[PDB]
Design brief:
The complex is a heterohexamer, with three copies of chain A (about 160 residues) and three copies of chain B (about 170 residues).
Chain A: H1 4-13, H2 21-46, H3 49-60, H4 78-101, H5 105-112, H6 115-121, H7 126-137, H8 145-161
Helix pairs in contact in A: 1-2, 2-4, 2-8, 3-4, 3-7, 4-5, 4-8, 7-8
Chain B: H1 4-13, H2 21-32, H3 34-46, H4 48-62, H5 76-99, H6 103-110, H7 113-120, H8 124-142, H9 154-168
Bound molecules: phycocyanobilin (9 copies).
InterPro entries (chains A, D, F): Globin-like_sf (IPR009050), Phycobilisome_asu/bsu (IPR012128), Phycobilisome_asu/bsu_sf (IPR038719), Phycocyanin_a (IPR006246)
Pfam families (chains A, D, F): Phycobilisome
Protein name (chains A, D, F): C-phycocyanin alpha subunit
Chain lengths: ~160, ~170, ~170, ~160, ~170, ~160
């Protein structure tokens, strides 16, 4: 998995050499940012439901056709809304993993890779999830760096969906 | 590979749940102790050549059969290969210390090593002795109170000893 | 690889003899039925994406454990890998239909597959269910009476079912 | 083995793609030619002996030195003529396999590959077999496409021997 | 690989000692016999094609099953492959003769050969017969008294027979 | 191991061909030189001690600091002189192996490879051994080719140490 620490090690390992000073400086930089990133992840984790449930509706309110339009890939049926809420948690959970791991690695491995094929195959509209994300970016009531770091992974998630 | 944070993330992902308070406290604790980890990697790394050499002299003086003609360390190309192995192990150990997880060490270095030495005739128990010799050299160097801000570092040194011990148990 | 004609030639060559009348009649019969074979390959090929997708939804709805966190199809990279496998199997099946022989399917695709999934932790019995789901989807699509000149195609559909069944038995 | 059908599949397989329309058209073309090629193979198969035995003599009549010149690689001895008749059947059998398989694949795999080394090593004169082939090309009493297809593999066999 | 001299050096090095008088006398003896060794390599090499061919005819006439349709030497590509193998073995044998040691023969050619033929269905006992046929052809050619300065060469011919026999025992 | 004979074979083996005349001529050349090279090795072998012990002192007499300067990599202690005499034998033994094997191969494999790393790691001064070698080059009382061949491997050993 990609993290500032693992990249550093991969770089020295590919050259059969011991870690360098610059790489050590990079891990220190990662530790200094760990503070605000960690409290961001804790905050988000403590406001899962209000964010998840709040994100769910923010997408039915902008894509109401998904509310009753017959089709398994829709939130017309209760299970459809179950699947949907499940996916929302997945996204929120991933961004907290990024904040925890100091990078996108977690989200790249578990969610981004194969994302397009998955959405294409099961006919899921990327915009649905993007609305979810825009709702979380403006709801997590985070400020300072904590908010700064979170929004970073949020936007990053938006890109990959576009 | 994984680092301390990544492993916790992987353990949580497999359960499809967010980190618990105990996991957050644990990762935050590692960060607060960050400087010590960096000092241990830096100190062991800067002395790599000395640790290997001193450990080599120690091992061979303790096991003179290896340097006898026909033993696995006789001839300069085999000795050079043995000193090289010791450096490889050490290098990967410093890697695991910086990460706070032994995955890189296991995956790149320990996996299959036992079989490799058996196929070559190289005595694994003897590699372990060398690995143990380096552990003591590295630890004394990393936990030296001179030229460093006094503080508890006893948790880190146990973690570091674990990695070495874990490397020795993979070839003993 | 071999096609229907090549296999008969290989069987005759090993006996150092010319084809018998029954073999000639058999190969000539396949040719007379040629159009149907081409229609089945064309129809299954044009719907490949639909067959895979519908079969995937079917499998996971029937086996919800696979898509649970920590199951072999969780995460988008594993799901993408699973959908890909289903497409690979299907692709090689269409290959065997066009040839009238399962050699290409066996040699390029089924050989060793069982071991490959066991080494990954991927449940073979579950791959079989997906392969069976595609068989039914593919066959219904290939034997649909709409938009095609009415005629017997029951021999071909059995041949096609055989290939799928043969693929499922190689991983069950 | 090479056949119009297998080549098509190899082409799509090397590109990890499903069969294309052109490839499908190629197999159709192969099926249309299968008719005359198959009856050619049946005809030839039904006139094996008369062709084989007739081919044998057509080469003793042009290379009589092989009739008594001492040397295991010669038809001087009865076993030498046995070997020779055996080889003739091999050739005839191969051309019928080609007609059956819609291509040279059968003859390339079982007879052409290593042909030169085999003739060099056992000291066999390519001309012997070529005379055999010229006799069959003018004896099989085939007409229309059936004859057209047969002669194609016949000439092809001649080339490889030259 | 090793040659006669190298092997003696390797045997002495493993004991960390200088060569003994018996080893010196032995290597010096080989040198004094040098011309004969060169004549055997030169003679077997110049006739390589004849040895292989005659041995091939001999083997197949003795074992007609191999050239029957469906046997391992049927078809020109398998026969070409068989003649090629015989040439490969011979080539490596001449290599061992020139060196006065069978290492190159063992390491490059005999190692694993048994398994290779078993995996292909090729009968090892039959390869041995061909190898034995070449031994007799090669030896008669190398020890022929015509066109060469008369002298004892009986030690060399035994050494040469050993290599062939050793090659046949690796696949029988 | 590298020897004129093995190189020849490696050359033909890399080209899947039988040995050539030139290669055969090369082995003959090797045999002709074998005479003087062998007697050189026998001579040296018969005057091991006088050469080894004589070589030991020739280096304490030029590097007396190694006589009592505390440090395991020194001949200050008796074991230090033991190690040292051991190494001297190793060198002498190797040069005789070269003379025996008609080349440097023996010395390249068992002593030269890893030489620098070994001397660096255990802190051994290359000059120590080079003095040893200069003493043997001028002590072996060899003349004619025997001496010529020996000196060749001796100088060769000097190079590698420089
Ligand atoms: C335990 C192993 C030993 C010990 C360690 C100890 N170290 C520190 C503090 C610091 N260490 C560094 C080192 C680095 N910082 C970096 O960014 C890098 C990469 C280039 C390195 C190598 C720094 C900068 C500090 C802080 C400033 C300082 O020197 O004091 C501490 C104090 C830790 C803390 O922040 O509270 C301790 C305890 N101390 C011991 O007694 C052990 C033998
Ligand atoms: C059985 C699977 C179904 C069925 C098949 C059926 N098809 C035909 C005839 C034709 N099929 C084609 C299709 C192709 N020809 C090609 O060269 C290619 C490659 C580009 C394709 C895809 C063609 C041209 C024909 C003939 C003309 C026509 O459309 O009629 C038949 C008739 C076969 C015959 O020749 O006698 C049949 C029976 N029919 C069914 O009811 C099944 C559901
Ligand atoms: C035993 C195998 C048969 C036999 C051999 C025999 N040969 C010689 C002598 C010579 N052989 C050569 C050949 C070469 N010299 C080379 O440098 C090369 C590489 C290009 C070759 C091929 C030569 C030059 C000689 C010496 C001159 C000569 O021809 O006499 C001997 C005599 C050996 C000796 O030096 O005392 C013998 C005995 N003799 C037999 O009867 C066996 C059938
Ligand atoms: C003698 C010239 C001086 C001297 C020597 C000394 N050497 C060592 C240790 C080693 N020497 C070697 C050399 C070789 N090993 C080989 O296998 C080969 C090729 C066959 C060679 C040339 C090696 C590998 C070692 C280290 C391993 C070992 O101790 O055996 C020492 C010991 C150093 C120590 O214990 O730390 C000494 C003292 N020292 C002098 O002062 C002489 C002038
Ligand atoms: C030293 C303490 C002991 C010793 C070591 C010795 N090792 C070898 C040979 C090999 N060692 C390895 C190990 C690795 N290669 C790697 O890339 C990695 C990182 C993933 C490791 C851990 C390998 C692959 C070999 C063989 C290939 C090679 O030589 O590079 C030898 C050589 C043996 C020989 O020449 O036959 C030796 C001597 N020997 C001892 O006596 C000590 C106890
Ligand atoms: C919610 C925003 C809307 C909605 C969702 C919906 N999603 C699915 C099905 C799937 N969703 C995923 C997504 C992921 N799987 C992962 O492992 C990860 C990373 C951890 C992600 C992001 C996948 C793979 C599927 C298919 C497999 C499955 O069903 O579990 C459905 C079901 C579609 C169907 O059954 O055919 C639905 C309904 N639908 C809406 O209308 C919301 C607006
Ligand atoms: C889907 C129905 C099920 C499923 C599949 C799944 N497969 C893999 C990984 C691999 N699959 C293959 C198979 C092939 N590769 C080929 O080239 C061919 C054609 C000859 C085949 C048949 C291979 C080689 C792999 C591993 C290498 C790779 O990932 O490409 C995975 C990934 C497992 C992992 O990441 O560890 C999965 C998930 N999984 C299911 O749950 C379904 C039952
Ligand atoms: C006949 C035209 C003349 C003739 C023939 C003759 N042939 C051989 C021996 C061999 N012929 C072959 C040819 C093939 N083997 C194959 O597998 C195939 C493809 C299916 C072919 C074309 C081979 C391999 C041999 C050698 C092995 C064997 O004997 O079976 C001989 C025997 C030579 C000998 O015993 O030394 C003869 C006599 N000879 C004539 O004079 C005719 C004009
Ligand atoms: C001849 C006397 C018998 C015989 C031989 C036969 N061999 C093969 C195939 C192979 N032989 C080898 C052997 C080597 N390859 C090498 O590079 C070396 C030098 C290190 C050796 C010794 C190999 C690797 C193969 C397989 C790969 C290939 O074909 O090149 C065949 C082919 C079998 C087949 O096509 O399936 C045959 C027929 N067969 C006999 O009946 C004789 C008893």
């Amino acid at each position: 998995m990609k993290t500032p620490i693992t990249e550093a090690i991969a770089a020295a390992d590919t050259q059969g050499r011991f870690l360098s000073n610059t790489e050590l400086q990079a891990v220190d930089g990662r530790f200094k940012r760990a503070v605000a990133s960690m409290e961001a992840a804790r905050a988000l984790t403590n406001n899962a439901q209000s964010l998840i449930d709040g994100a769910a509706q923010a997408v039915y309110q902008k894509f109401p056709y998904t509310t009753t339009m017959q089709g398994s890939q829709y939130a017309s049926t209760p299970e459809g809304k179950a699947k949907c809420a499940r996916d929302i948690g997945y996204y929120l959970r991933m961004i907290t993993y990024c904040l925890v791991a100091g990078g996108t690695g977690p989200m790249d491995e578990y969610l981004i890779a194969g994302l397009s094929e998955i959405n294409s195959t099961f006919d899921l509209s990327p915009s649905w999830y993007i609305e979810a994300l825009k709702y979380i970016k403006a709801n997590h009531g985070l400020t300072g760096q904590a908010a700064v770091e979170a929004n970073a992974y949020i936007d990053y998630a938006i890109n990959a969906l576009s | 590979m994984l680092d301390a944070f990544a492993k916790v993330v992987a353990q949580a992902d497999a359960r499809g749940e967010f980190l618990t308070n105990a996991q957050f406290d644990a990762l935050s604790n590692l960060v607060k102790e960050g400087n010590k980890r960096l000092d241990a990697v830096n100190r062991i790394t800067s002395n790599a050549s000395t640790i290997v050499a001193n450990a080599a002299r120690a091992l061979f003086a303790e096991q003179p059969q290896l340097i006898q003609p026909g033993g696995n360390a006789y001839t300069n190309r085999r000795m050079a290969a043995c000193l090289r192995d010791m450096e490889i192990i050490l290098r990967y150990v410093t890697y695991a210390i910086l990460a706070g997880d032994s995955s890189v060490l296991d995956d790149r270095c320990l996996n299959g090593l036992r079989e490799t030495y058996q196929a070559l005739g190289t005595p694994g128990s003897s590699v372990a002795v060398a690995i143990q010799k380096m552990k003591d050299a590295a630890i004394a160097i990393a936990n030296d109170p001179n030229g460093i801000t006094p503080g508890d570092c006893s948790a880190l040194m146990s973690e570091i000893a674990g990695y070495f011990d874990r490397a020795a148990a993979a070839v003993a």
